[PDB]
Amino acid sequence: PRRRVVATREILPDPKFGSQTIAKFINHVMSHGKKSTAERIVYGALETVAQKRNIEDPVAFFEDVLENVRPMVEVKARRVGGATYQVPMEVRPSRRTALAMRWLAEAAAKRSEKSMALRLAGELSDASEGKGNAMKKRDEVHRMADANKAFS
Amino acid sequence: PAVKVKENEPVDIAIRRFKRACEKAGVLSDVRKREFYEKPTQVRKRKKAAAVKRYKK
Amino acid sequence: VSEGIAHIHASFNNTIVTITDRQGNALAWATSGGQGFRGSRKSTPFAAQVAAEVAGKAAQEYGVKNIDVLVKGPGPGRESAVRALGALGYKVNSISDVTPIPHNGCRAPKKRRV
RNA sequence: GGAGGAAUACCGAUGGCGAAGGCAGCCUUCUGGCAUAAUACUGACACUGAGGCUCGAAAGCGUGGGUAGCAAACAGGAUUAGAUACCCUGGUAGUCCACGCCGUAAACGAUGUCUACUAGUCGUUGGGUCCGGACUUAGUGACGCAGCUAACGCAAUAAGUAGACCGCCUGGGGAGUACGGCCGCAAGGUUAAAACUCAAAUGAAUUGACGGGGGCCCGCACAAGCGGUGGAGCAUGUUGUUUAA
């Protein structure tokens, strides 16, 4: 906005797991202000995946999967001499997390399972094992940079 | 524009010295003038303008 | 052949790198078009670097451990080709520029207006 | 490895020479000017210049040679609504040489030639004289008084104060056009009107506006995100039509 940078609002961590990232993820799933619905959907999906994998710490599993999902490099458009070309640049640390969360939400939207919690659990499993639309999207974002890699 | 690199020396520093040598010899300007033909009147007018700029400096 | 001379015909449009023996025979050559880079992508230092790497490998099969570069023309990837040789690990005795400097021997093309 | 043509990087500089037009690698032959040095000389031989004649960029013309690059014309490729153009891949005349025509350029310092006078300053090229500097000469530039100018600006290289002679101008078009001479192979050049037509055509500078001119800066203006209109039904307004409205 061509104006001073200001401190971001402090997020409220989730109660059950006491983790910042979990609430940050719940925010994206929330729609029309239905934070109560988002909490329930996220908790159900995490419980389903944790039960399936027999893992004691769903928060740790989620941290590992999110870290894997986040893309290191994202292409950014630049204008030089009245010309438009792709330019690969290192992504900002917070932006990596935001991108991964958004992509997981988007793919969970189109997953087949009848209920949102099951769609989300399936997408987390596929992301953890490196399969599915979210991993394909991250691979496409990496692929665009890899294709040319002739700038910066 | 010939540059000799000593044994067990990094390639990048030798490249930088070669660039400095080429800049010192002014090789690039000759090629730039060569690429496009320029009218002699335009040459004379540009030379006069450059002389005036040098005088102001 | 245990000694090599590399000739680079760099130019704003395209850059060509070739490997030759001391006597003046070219064992192998590499070009950007073979890499497939085109247009603006073709006319970039990285397109020069990759082709330089390919030509360096091609020369490695022949067996030249020492090569000296001879740049020609005002290309933007001439530095990148030497960087590519340095990254490959070829050892360069010297860096020299063999760009032709014709002393108004021939008339140049008419200026372009845009 | 040869063959063939043109030009002469660097040196190179509001540097140098020439009456202008113009003149760049290097050695040789012939050649015209200018600068200064102290002597010796003639003793107004001077300046300007109607006609006239000499030279006169580039392009062009005629005959004969040469033809690498470049390139009018021409061919094909592109964008474009079209592109007889700008960009492009080729490309003949021409540009190069010998001998003759052509005699026109924004041929400009948009400033005729020659004199005498009028503060100062820092440059720079070629000489001179003095103790690296000071001094003086004919050119060569950049600032800056008096003075001049509509104002820009000029300012010892005057557009300042005077003088000699020559050329030219009398609103903008029609028009440097027609007719007639003169020149030319030609293209065309030179001298040079009238009918008619409008009240303007102009120059400098000021305030604004604008630019596909610049410098900086701001707004959810774009970016990055969220969710909407544009598709369905309905409520509402408006054009349209139909209506007596």
Give, in degrees to the nearest 5, the angle at Cα B53 between B49 and B57: 170
**Chains B and A touch, contact meaning at least 3 pairs of CB atoms under 8 angstroms apart:** no
d(CA A142, CA A140): 5
Q: Chain B: nearest CA to C5, how far in angstroms?
A: 14
Q: Which residues of B13-44 are buried (b: 16+ CB within 10 A; e: fewer)?
A: ebbeebeebbeeeebeebeeebeeeeeeeeee
Longest dimension (CA), chain B: 52
Residue C6 to chain B, least CA–CA distance (Å): 14
The two tokens of residue A113 are: 């399972």
Resolution in A: 3.2
The sign of the dihedral angle between the CA atoms of B6, B12, B18, B23 is: negative
Q: Name the residue among A144, B32, A150 with its Cα closest to residue C45.
A: A150
C112 touches strand D (CB under 7 A): yes
Contact C67, C19 (CB under 8 A): yes
Q: Name the residue among C1, C6, C25 with its Cα closest to residue C16.
A: C6
The angle, 0 to 180 degrees and rounded to 10, between the axes of the packed helices B11-25 and C78-88 is 160
- By CA distance, what is C50's nearest residue in A? A150
Rg (CA), chain A: 17
Nearest-CA distance B57 → chain C (Å)? 30
Which structural technique was applied? cryo-EM
Nucleotide minimizing C1' to CA distance for residue C109: D70
Closest residue of chain A to C42, computed from CA coordinates: A150
The CA distance from C73 to C101, in Å, is 10
Sheet holding B2-4, edge to edge: B2-4, C94-97, C67-72, C4-10, C15-20, C26-31
Say if CB C13 and CB C20 are below 8 A apart. Answer: no
User: What is the spatial distance between Cα C14 and Cα C55, in angstroms, rounded to a whole number?
Assistant: 16
Is strand D in 7 Å reach of the CB of C104? yes
B1 and chain C: CB distance < 8 Å anywhere? yes
